[PDB]
Amino acid sequence: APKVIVFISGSCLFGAISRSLFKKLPIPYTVVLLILGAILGVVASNVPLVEEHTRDVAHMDPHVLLQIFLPVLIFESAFAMDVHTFMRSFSQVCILALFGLVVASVLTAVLAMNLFNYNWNFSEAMMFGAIMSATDPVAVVALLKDLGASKQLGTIIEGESLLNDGCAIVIFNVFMKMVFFPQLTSTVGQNVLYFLQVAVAGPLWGYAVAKVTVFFLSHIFNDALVEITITLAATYLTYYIGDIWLEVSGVLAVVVLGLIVNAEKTSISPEVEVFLHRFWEMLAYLANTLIFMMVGVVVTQKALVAVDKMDWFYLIILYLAITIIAGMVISLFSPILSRIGYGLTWRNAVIMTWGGLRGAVGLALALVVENLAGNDVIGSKFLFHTAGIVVLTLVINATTIQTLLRILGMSDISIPKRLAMAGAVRRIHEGQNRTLNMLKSDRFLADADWDIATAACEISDPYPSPREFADMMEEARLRMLKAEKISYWKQFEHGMLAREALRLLVQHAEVAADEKDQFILVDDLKKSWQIKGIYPWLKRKLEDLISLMYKICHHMAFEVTINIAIVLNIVPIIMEFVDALRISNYVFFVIYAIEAIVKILGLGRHYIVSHWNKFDAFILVVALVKVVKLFRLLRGLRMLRLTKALIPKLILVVNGKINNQLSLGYDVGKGYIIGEEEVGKIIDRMVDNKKILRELKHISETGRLQVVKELGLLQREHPGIAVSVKTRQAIRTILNHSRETIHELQGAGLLDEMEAHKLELTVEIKMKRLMNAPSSIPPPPPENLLKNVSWLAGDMKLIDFIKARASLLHFDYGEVIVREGDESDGLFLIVSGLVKLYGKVFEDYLTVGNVIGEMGVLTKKPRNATVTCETTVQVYFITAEDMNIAIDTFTLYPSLEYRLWRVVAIRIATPLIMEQMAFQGWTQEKVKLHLERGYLVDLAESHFQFNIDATLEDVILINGTAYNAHTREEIRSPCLISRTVHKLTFQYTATEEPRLFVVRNAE
C-alpha cells in the first residue's frame, strides 16, 4: 500500500512556512522549496524509512503530471487574467507568441546539437529546446503593476506568456511521441490532419462548450451552488473530451474556455467569480508546491550522480545563451509589431527581456522526460539542466530585476506617488488626530492607555516673459489633465461609467499627460464608436434582405413542432452513414405523410414564399420517391428547414455585437463630454491668465462640440441599437440610485439587515435581468415622443389638446428654421434628425426628443439663436396662440405655467450652481438631483414678499430685477443671490414678472 499522506501534508506545511517566512525577502520562496526537497532527497537516499515514505510520490506516473498538473497550471493562468484588453488584439498577440516560441526553440535546439557533447538527435534537441522556452512573467507583471509603466502592457505580456506555455506543451508532446514512442508511422497527410485537429478543432470545441455554459448560466437567478457546480462540471467535461481525443495537446480547448467564461462575467454572480478564482488559485498553488518538492528530491537522488565539470560549464553557457536569444527574439520581432499601440521604450524592452523567470511547466516536462527515459542518461541530463536553469533564473533575475530597473529609469515612483500618496497620508493623519482628540474628552474611555493607542493607530507612507508664460501653460495643462482624471473616476464611483470606458479614458489621459504639449485629442477617442463600420454592419444588411395556419395555428410552438420533428428525424437519418430498418422505414413513411399533408395545406398559401417553398417542394419530391445506396442518403438531405429559422438567430447575434460596440462608444463619449463640462467650470478660478484660460476654453469647446456631433450622427445612423443602449443606461442609473437609497435607509437604522438583504436581492435580480435584455428596441412613433415630454406627461387632457393642435414639419439639409431677433412663432420638438443651434458666440447640437423655444413662448422674448438643419429633420410644431390658450385653460396645481417655468428654471440654474463652487465634488448629476428637490412658490400668495430662513441651501434669481427689504437691494437675472442678504419683497410690474428658485436643505 502506497504511503502519500506524510509527503502531501509536509509539502503543504513547508509551503506555508516558506511562503510566510520569505514574504519580506526579495528572493522567491520556491527556491526554499527546492532546497528543502533536496535535503529530504539526500535523507531518503540515506535513511530507508524516509525513502519508503517518499518513493510513492517522488517517482509518480508521468500521466499524473500530464493529465492533472499541467491542465490545472495552464487553466489557472488563463482564467485568472483579465481579457477585455488582451482580446482586443488577440490574433496578433497569438501570432507573436507562436513565432517567438518557435524561433527560440530552434536556436536552443541548434545550441543543444553543436555545443553539447551528447549524441542528441533533432527530436531530442527540439524537445530540449521546447522545455527551456517556457517562461513566467510573474515578477515582471508584479513589478510593472505598482510602478505604473502601463496597465495595457502587463496584460499583453501575461497573455503572451500564457500562449507561450500552451504552444510549448503542444510541441513538447509532438516531439515526445517521436522520441519515446517511435512505433508510430504517421504520414505527411496524417500529420497535416493532426495539425488541423490540434490547432483548430480543439479551440473550437472549447469555444462551443463555453458558449453553451454561458447560455445556461445566464438563466439562473439567485443560486450560487448551481452556477458553481455547472461551471466546474463544464470545465471537467471539456477537459475529459479534449483529453481522450487530443491527449495532452488538447489543453488549448480548456484554455479557450478559461478565456471565454472570463470574458462573459456578467452572466456570473460576483460571489461565484470570487469563489472560482480562489478555488483555482488554491489548486494551482498545491500543484506548484508539489512539483517543486518532487523535482528537488528526484534531482538530488538521481541526477546528481552522473554529472561532470563539463556539465556545469555547459549549464553556464546555456544560461548565457538563453538570455542572448531571449533578447534576440524581442529585438527582431517587437519593433516590427508597433501596431499594438504599446511601442517599446528602452526601459520596458530590457525589463521584459531580463525578467524571464522559469517556472513549473518546464520542471514538469523535465520530470515527464526523466520518468519516460528509464535508465538512460538523457533524463538525468534533461532534469539537471532544467533544474539548474530554473535555479539560476530564480536567483539572479528575480533578485536583480529591481536593480536593473533602477539603473535604467531609476525605478522612481514619479508624481502619482510623490504627491497623491502624500495628500492622503497627511489628511488621514489629521482625521486620526481629530478622532483621538474627540476620544480624549470622553467620559468612559478617559482611563485608556493613550500611548498604546497613539503608537498603534498611526500609519506610514508606503513610498510677461515667454518662459514664465510656458511655465504657467504647462501648469494649467497638467491641472486640467488631473481634474479630468478626477472627473472620470468620480463618474465611475457613481455608476455612470463602465470599467472599460473609464480605463480607456484614463489611458488616454495618461498618454496625453507625459507628452510635452498634448491634450485629450478627439482622434484617439474616435476609435471607440467608429468600430461599427466593419463586416458586422454589412452582414446584418445582407441578412436583412434574405428574411388559416399563419395566424390561427400560430403560437409559440407553431414552427417549433416542425423543428422538433426535424430533431426527432435526424437520428434515423444519421444512422444510415454510421433488424431495426423496418421501424425506421415506418416512421420515415409516417413523417413523410405528415409533411405531405402539411404541404397540401400549404398549397393554399398562394405560393408566396420564393426560397423556402421551393426547397420544401424539392424535399417533398425527394421524399415521395448502385443508385439505391445513393438514394439511402439522398433522402437524408432534409436540413433545408433549419436555415429558415437560423437567420433570426444570426441577426440577433450580429445585433448583440453591434450593441456591445455601441455601448462602449456611447459611454466613452458621454464621459468625455461630462468631464470637459465639469473641468471648464473648475479651471475658471484656478488660472491667473486671461489668454491661457481663453485658449483652454476654446479647445475644450471645440472637442466637446466635435464629440457631441459625432454621437448625434451615430444615433442617426441606426435607431434601434441606440434606443436599446440608451434604455439600458437609464435603467442602470435608476437601479444604482435605488440601491444607494436602500443603503442610506440601512445606515440610518430604519431598516433591519434582513430587510435590506431582501431589497438588495430584488435589485440584483433586476440588474441581472436587465443585462440580458434585447439588443435592438424599435424606435417609437412620433406620437409617443410627443406624449412623453416632461411637461406634458401625466395629463391626458393636455396630451389630447396638444396632439390635436400639433403639426409635422419636414426640412432638408441647409434650411434655416428660425433666425435671431425674430418674434417667437411657437414651440418646436425634434422627433427625427440632428440640428444645430448657434447664436449669441455659442453653438450646440440638438437631437431627437429635445424642445426649442420654451423661453420664447414663456417670456415672449425675441429669438436669440439661428437653428439650421444638419440633416433632414422632422419636427413637431405648436403655435404660440395655442400654447397661450392651453396656459390660460389649465388652472390646476400642476399648472402648465408652473411646469414650463420649473423646467427652464432648473436648466438656467444648474450652470450657476456649477460656477459658484463654494465646495468641492459638486458634480453636474448631484447638482441636478439637489435642484430637483427644490420648488418655486408664487409671490401672489405671500403678498409679493419673501422671508429668508437658513433652511435654504441656495437661492437663485431666474427672472426679473430683485429688490431686497434693505436699501432695496437690486440685482439682475439670472444671478446667484449673494450669501449675505435678508428678506426681500417685490413690486407688481406688468411688463416683467420676476420669479425665483429656492431650494431647502435635506429635510
Next chain:
Amino acid sequence: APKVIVFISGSCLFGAISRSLFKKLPIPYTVVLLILGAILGVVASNVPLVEEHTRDVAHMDPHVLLQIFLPVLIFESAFAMDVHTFMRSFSQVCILALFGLVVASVLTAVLAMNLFNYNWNFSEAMMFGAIMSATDPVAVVALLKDLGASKQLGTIIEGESLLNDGCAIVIFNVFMKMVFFPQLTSTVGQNVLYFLQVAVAGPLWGYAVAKVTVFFLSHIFNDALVEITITLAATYLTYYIGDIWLEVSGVLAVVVLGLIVNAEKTSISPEVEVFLHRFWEMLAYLANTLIFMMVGVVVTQKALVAVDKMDWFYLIILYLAITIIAGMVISLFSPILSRIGYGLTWRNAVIMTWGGLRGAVGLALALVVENLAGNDVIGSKFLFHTAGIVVLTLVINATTIQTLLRILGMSDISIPKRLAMAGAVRRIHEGQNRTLNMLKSDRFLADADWDIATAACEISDPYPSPREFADMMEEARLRMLKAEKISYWKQFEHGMLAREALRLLVQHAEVAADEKDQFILVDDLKKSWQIKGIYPWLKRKLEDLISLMYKICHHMAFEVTINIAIVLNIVPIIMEFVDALRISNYVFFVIYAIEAIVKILGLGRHYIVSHWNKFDAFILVVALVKVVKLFRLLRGLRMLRLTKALIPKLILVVNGKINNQLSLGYDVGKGYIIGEEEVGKIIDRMVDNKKILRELKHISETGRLQVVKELGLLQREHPGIAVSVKTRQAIRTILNHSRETIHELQGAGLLDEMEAHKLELTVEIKMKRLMNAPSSIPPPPPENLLKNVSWLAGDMKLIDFIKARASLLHFDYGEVIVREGDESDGLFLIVSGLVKLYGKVFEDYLTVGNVIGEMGVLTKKPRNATVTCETTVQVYFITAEDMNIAIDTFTLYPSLEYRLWRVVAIRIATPLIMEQMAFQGWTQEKVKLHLERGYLVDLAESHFQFNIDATLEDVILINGTAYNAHTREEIRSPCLISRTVHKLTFQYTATEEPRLFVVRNAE
C-alpha cells in the same frame, strides 16, 4: 473498469434542474431527485446498458458512505451554524438532545418489536430506531427566520438537531457492530473504556487540534492561500486520526473542531470565512444529491420486489407513531428545561414538533444496512420503511407546516413588516420617481424607451379619560422602544457596537416590546457584566499567590534553553516504557552533569525560591543515583520544571476569559447608556402629555444612573482588564474612522483604486494585530494620568508647572469634598475611585481621569453640586491661585484660558445641538465630531463685533448676554441662537465676558 462519469454528471445536471424548477413550488426539490432515481432504476432494471452505467455508483461500498459522505454532511452542519448563542447554554442543550434521541430510539425499537411481524432482535430494532430518530430542522429554521418568532430559537433547534444526528450515528455504529459482526466479544470494562474513548477522548482530540489550528492561524497576515490550506489540512488530519482509531465515531471530534473553529472567527480573514463556507456547502450539496439518487435507484431495483400490503399498513402505523413520540418527548422534556431564558409558547412547540423532516443521514444509514445485509430481507425492509418515512415527511410536513402555522398564529407578519417594510417601499418609490424625473429632462437619454424603464425599474412589497391616558402611554412606550432599537442599530453601523452586544440589546428590546407594560429593565442587562463572578476569578486569585544569572544570563531564551533541554530529554525518557541504550545513557549522563553544574551555579542564589528549588534538588538527587526496573522510570519523573513556566500561560488564558466577558459587558452597558441618552432627547418633542414625559424621563434617568454606577464599580474591581478593554475600544474607533476617511477619499476621486487597496490593507493588518493584543494592560501611575489631560498634553513646561504645584488627596467612604454655594477652592482630577456629583435635581457619577471644577476656576462662580465619595477616592488638587498664575503666565496661541474655554464650550454645547434636532439621524458621536471642527475667535481682534455668514452650520451662546445689531437683540447664555438673526456686536463688560462658539460647514 467501472463507469462513473455519466452517473455523477447526470446527478449534478438533474440536481441543478430540480433545484431551479422547484424554487417557487412549496414542495422540496429532493423528492424530484427521488422520483428521477426511481425512473432511472426501473429503466436500468429493464435496459442492460443503463444497468451497466448505473451499477457501479448505485451499489457502492458502505465505507464510502461511512467514511466520506456522513463526515461531510455532519461537518457542514456543524461549521455553518453560528455558535455564540448556542454555546452559551452548550452543556444543557447537549444533555437535552442526547436524552431526547435516546428515549425516542427506545420507543421506536419497542414499536418495531411488538407491532412488526418480522422476528427482530433488540439490536436490530435499536438500529432501526436510531435510523428513524434522525431529523432535519431546515424547513423549521427557514420558516422561523423570516417570521421573526425568535433569533434565539432557530439556533437552539439547529444545534439540537446537529447533536441528534451525531449521537444517532454513534449508536447506529454501536448496534451495527453487534448485528452484522457478531464475532467480537465485549465485557463490562471493555464497553466502559470504549464509551470513555468515544464520548470523551474524541471531542478532546478535536478541541486540541482546533486550538492548535487557531493558534497558528492567528499569526498569518495577508495570506489567504496559507490560511485556507492550513484549515483544510487540519480538517483532514483531524478526520483521519479520529477515523483510524474510532471508525465512524470520529464525527464527534470533527464536529467539535468545526464548532471551535467557527467560534474563533476573528483569527480568520472574512474572505477565508466566505470561501470555506461556500466550499463546504458545495461538498454537502453534492453528497446530498448523490445520496438521494442512489437511494431512489436501489429502492426501486431491490426493495420493491419483496413488499406486501401489510408492509404499507406498517409504514402508515409507523408514520403515525413517530409523530406521536416526537410530540411526547418534547411534551415531557422541554417544559422542564425552561431555564435557557427562551420559553416555549403554544405555537412554537407545535411548529418544532410538526416540522420534523427526515434527511439524508437516515437514508445513508439505511443504504449501509442494505449493503451489509446481503441477500437477507432485513436490508430491504430497512430501506423500504426509511424511504417511505422520508417521502411521507417530505410531502406532508413540508407542505402543511405553513398551513399549521396559519391555523395556530395566523402566520401573520406582525408589525415589523406591516409598517417598516411599507416606509421603505414608499420612500424607495419616491426616490425612483425623482431619479426618473431627473433623467427625463436630460440631453442624451431623451430618446430612451421610458415605458420599458418605468415598468422594469419599479419594485414590489415582499409582504382626560383614563382609557385615553393608557392609550397615549402605550403609544409613547412603543415609540421609545422603537427609538431605542433605531439607536442601537445606528451604533452598530458606525462600528461603536459589536454584533453580540447589539443582538443582546435588541433581544431585550423585543422581549420588552410584546409585554403589556415593561421597559428595558436593568436586571436583564445585568447578566452581561456580572458573569465575571464565577470560578475564573477564584482561579486567577489562587494562581496569583503561587507565582549573575537572573539578569546577566537573562534573555528571551534563558529558561527556554532548559525547556528545550527537557523537550530533547523526554524522547529518551519516554522510550523506556514503550542496542541503543548506550547512547541514551551517555546523553543522560551529559544532561545530568549539565544540570548538576546548573544547580552548582544556583547554590549561590541564596535558596530564595521554596518550591522550584526543592523540586530541582530532588530531581538532582534522583538523577545522581527488581528495583532496577523501577529506577529505570524513577529518573524519568523530571516533568516538574514545565509547571514552573506553565503557570503564566494559565494566568494568561484566565485573563483572556475574563477580558472576553468584560468586553461584552462594557459594550452592552455603553450601548444602553448611549441609547437612553439619545432617546431622552428624541422623545422630548414627540409626547403630548407632561405627566407621561416626566415618568419616561424619570425611569430613563434611574436606569442610566444604575448602569453607570455598576460600570464604575466593575472598573474599580480589577483595573488591568478594564484598561485593556478600554484601550481596545479606543483603537477600534480610531481604525474605523480612518477606514471611513479612506473610503471618502476614494469616492471623491482623489485616490486611485490600488492606493485605496493598499491603505485598506494596512488598516486591516492593524485591526488583526489589535485583535490579538495583551488581555491585561497594567494601570498607569497618577503622573501619567496628570500628564495626559486634554488641556495639558503637548506642553512640557505647562506639565512641569502643574505637576510641581499639584497635591495628592485621599478620601474615605462617606466624606464630602465640596458642597454647593461655596467658592471654588480649585480644580480636581479623579485618579482613583468612583465619586458622586449631585446637585441642582441632577446626579451623576465620575470615575478616574475626570476633571471637576473647570467652570468654577474659569468664571469664578460658586459651586453648584455636592461631591461625595462613593468609595475611597484618590484625587489630584491644584489651587485656584496657581491656576490663575498659569493662566496669566502662558500667552501663546494654545492658551490655557482658550483650551479650558474650548473644553467647557464643547461640553456645554453638545446637549444644545442634541436637543435642537433640526435633521434626524443625529448621533451623539457625529454631533461631537461636528463640534470638534469648530473654534471660537476672540472679539478683541474683531473690535467686539461679529459678522454672520451662512458658512456657519450652528452658532451657540456659551457665555454672557448677546446684543445683536438689530434692536440690540438680547439673549441669555447658554442658548442656541435663533436661526433668523443678523450680525451682532458686544460691549466690554468687566464683570462678565460673553464668549461664543461658531462652527463652519464642511470646507
